[PDB]
UniProtKB/Swiss-Prot annotation:
<feature type="binding site">
    <location>
        <position position="553"/>
    </location>
    <ligand>
        <name>[4Fe-4S] cluster</name>
    </ligand>
</feature>
<dbReference type="Pfam" id="PF05187">
    <property type="entry name" value="Fer4_ETF_QO"/>
</dbReference>
<keyword id="KW-0560">Oxidoreductase</keyword>
<dbReference type="Pfam" id="PF21162">
    <property type="entry name" value="ETFQO_UQ-bd"/>
</dbReference>
<keyword id="KW-0813">Transport</keyword>
<dbReference type="InterPro" id="IPR007859">
    <property type="entry name" value="ETF-QO/FixX_C"/>
</dbReference>
<feature type="modified residue" description="N6-acetyllysine">
    <location>
        <position position="321"/>
    </location>
</feature>
<dbReference type="GO" id="GO:0005739">
    <property type="term" value="C:mitochondrion"/>
</dbReference>
<feature type="modified residue" description="N6-acetyllysine">
    <location>
        <position position="96"/>
    </location>
</feature>
<keyword id="KW-0408">Iron</keyword>
<feature type="binding site">
    <location>
        <position position="270"/>
    </location>
    <ligand>
        <name>a ubiquinone</name>
    </ligand>
</feature>
<keyword id="KW-0479">Metal-binding</keyword>
<keyword id="KW-0597">Phosphoprotein</keyword>
<dbReference type="InterPro" id="IPR040156">
    <property type="entry name" value="ETF-QO"/>
</dbReference>
<dbReference type="GO" id="GO:0016020">
    <property type="term" value="C:membrane"/>
</dbReference>
<feature type="intramembrane region">
    <location>
        <begin position="73"/>
        <end position="94"/>
    </location>
</feature>
<keyword id="KW-0411">Iron-sulfur</keyword>
Amino acid sequence: CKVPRITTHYTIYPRDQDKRWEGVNMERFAEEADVVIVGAGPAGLSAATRLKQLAAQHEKDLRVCLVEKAAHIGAHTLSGACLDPRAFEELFPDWKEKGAPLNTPVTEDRFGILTEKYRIPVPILPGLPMNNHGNYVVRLGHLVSWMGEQAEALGVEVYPGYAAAEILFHEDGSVKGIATNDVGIQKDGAPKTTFERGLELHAKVTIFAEGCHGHLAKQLYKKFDLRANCEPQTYGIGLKELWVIDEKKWKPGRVDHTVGWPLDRHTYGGSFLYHLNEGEPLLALGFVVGLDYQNPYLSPFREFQRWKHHPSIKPTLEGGKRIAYGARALNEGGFQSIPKLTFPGGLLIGCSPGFMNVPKIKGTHTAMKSGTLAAESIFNQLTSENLQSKTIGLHVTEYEDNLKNSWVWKELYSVRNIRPSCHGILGVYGGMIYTGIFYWIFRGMEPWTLKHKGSDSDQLKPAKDCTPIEYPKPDGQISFDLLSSVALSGTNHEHDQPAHLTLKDDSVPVNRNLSIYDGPEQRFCPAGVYEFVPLEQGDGFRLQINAQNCVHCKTCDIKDPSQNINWVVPEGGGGPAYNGM
Ligand SMILES: Cc1cc2nc3c(=O)[nH]c(=O)nc-3n(C[C@H](O)[C@H](O)[C@H](O)COP(=O)(O)OP(=O)(O)OC[C@H]3O[C@@H](n4cnc5c(N)ncnc54)[C@H](O)[C@@H]3O)c2cc1C
Ligand SMILES: COC1=C(OC)C(=O)C(C/C=C(\C)CC/C=C(\C)CC/C=C(\C)CC/C=C(\C)CCC=C(C)C)=C(C)C1=O
Ligand SMILES: CCCCCCO[C@@H]1O[C@H](CO)[C@@H](O)[C@H](O)[C@H]1O
Ligand SMILES: CCCCCCO[C@@H]1O[C@H](CO)[C@@H](O)[C@H](O)[C@H]1O
Ligand code: SF4
Ligand code: NA
């Protein structure tokens, strides 16, 4: 054996095309519902909840099935989480006595610009977007878990551990529904004696709420040419760890943000540090880096680990304990990047299509509202005659009409130029200047909309033209390595299954990436999944994919300069085991 056909997933090598599957029956059982929702995130749960609420108010029968990758609800949820209650209280005006975990109202907002040695404080006025008056600091994972609890109580059929692995289409071309992941296929693609076909969930309308860079939505965009009038989405990667600190340095209700060191002015990114007020002297902290970065040598993980040593931060975690680690990609393309959210047989909500306010670093409240609106609109179409056809699947276009008229649209429109304004000669500092003028003073009224520089994927420079970055060795107390970090994510998968990190051509990572960019996949992956192993015969490397370490952040599918990777779901239940992240 060899070079190793790293790729054996059925999505690249159809088993309808390989002899090893000759005798196997691929017949799947099917279940019928009115609405099928993919992803138990704040958006999917908002949609599900509201739909079962609308059903109760008007006494109608509605079968709503919600499927999620996570072993249990909230396990793949990663956010820093400063919450704008606006849409949440709309869905649950009753939350306080019903027990929702919004125990930390923001009491102090701080922002600073860092240099290697110091911190420059920045005045936070009520007029800027980094103002958190009226908001809560929360462990999104727990709020999500709480939501799944209310959803079930309302009659929603929640299915954690089930990954939507395949979109179903009616012959007229509209979406019929989805099928869950099959199970029991070995690493090489061969069927096991335990092979088991997935479940088919049919509905009049399927809601897609996979979050930032959903793998089914990525293909949905293609199928219905949904990006026709929009700039492609732009992203950033968010790394995060939970810490237990010295009571003496615990300032409950405090929200910190910083820009500057260790990033150069042309690399977008920053930190967040929030003091939780849920009983323990706990801190949710993390780092963000725009995947539009240019240096192939940059490592967002090392930037984050190195960031903690800055003198304004290290003392705070000194004597502290790091108890969890996770990473997720987020949207930063904002308004200019919103695709068409509707098509025959389905809808897109939440960060999958992307409603993130990047300067506020908030996308949960808007993801919730989109779920609330999509629900109201769908129930609305299920409750009439006014029959639209030839698409057995409904085209709930009214959803986009109403979203365009909600506060969500104007909020995203108003901060649309902040992220793109960071592409000037002053980089992120130019963006700050632009924010003081056109937002703080003109609230984004300027008669124009700036554009992004294109896809994050073609923003990389060749390694020979750049200078490697010298990162410090972790000290095991404030900074750690990747392996220990992966352990604190509790992520895991059945080892004997084909890699879900699929390659379209098994030779480009060694022939192009390593050759031209020096294998950026070994540094942009926050989990150490891709590694180049020294070749046995003579001279080079081979790429090895350690699919079991994947935290499902979706970065590699976003940043690969050769766009040769396609992330798909592994067997349901695999991945992070985040608790209140
Ligand atoms: C580091 C970081 C910090 C952040 N800080 C804030 C903040 O302070 N405030 C704020 O409002 N927002 C913040 N956000 C953003 C916030 O987390 C998101 O906007 C929000 O979670 C988006 O929600 P969602 O409901 O679309 O999906 P997500 O929370 O992304 O969840 C999508 C769900 O879908 C599941 N899924 C995906 N594909 C499939 C499939 N095919 N089959 C089954 N299940 C599937 C996933 O497992 C996941 O649970 C932050 C994000 C990051 C990464
Ligand atoms: C952790 O996440 C992150 C942030 O959030 C904490 C960020 O910010 C940034 C970077 C910068 C951006 C997005 C531009 C945003 C604007 C800010 C932060 C406003 C702060 C300061 C201003 C506006 C200074 C005042 C302006 C002056 C004096 C100009 C002169 C004339 C007048 C207007 C009177 C990044 C990369 C980030 O990752
Ligand atoms: C041109 C500058 C004029 C004076 C601004 C006065 O008062 C302003 O109140 C708002 C709150 O509404 C804050 O956001 C501003 O930072 C503060 O300066
Ligand atoms: C600063 C980062 C991106 C924004 C591009 C804006 O530059 C333009 O400059 C001229 C001055 O020459 C102004 O009169 C215009 O109103 C402004 O849009
Ligand atoms: S393989 Fe991809 S999706 Fe998994 S953690 Fe690494 S970059 Fe994220
Ligand atoms: Na557009």
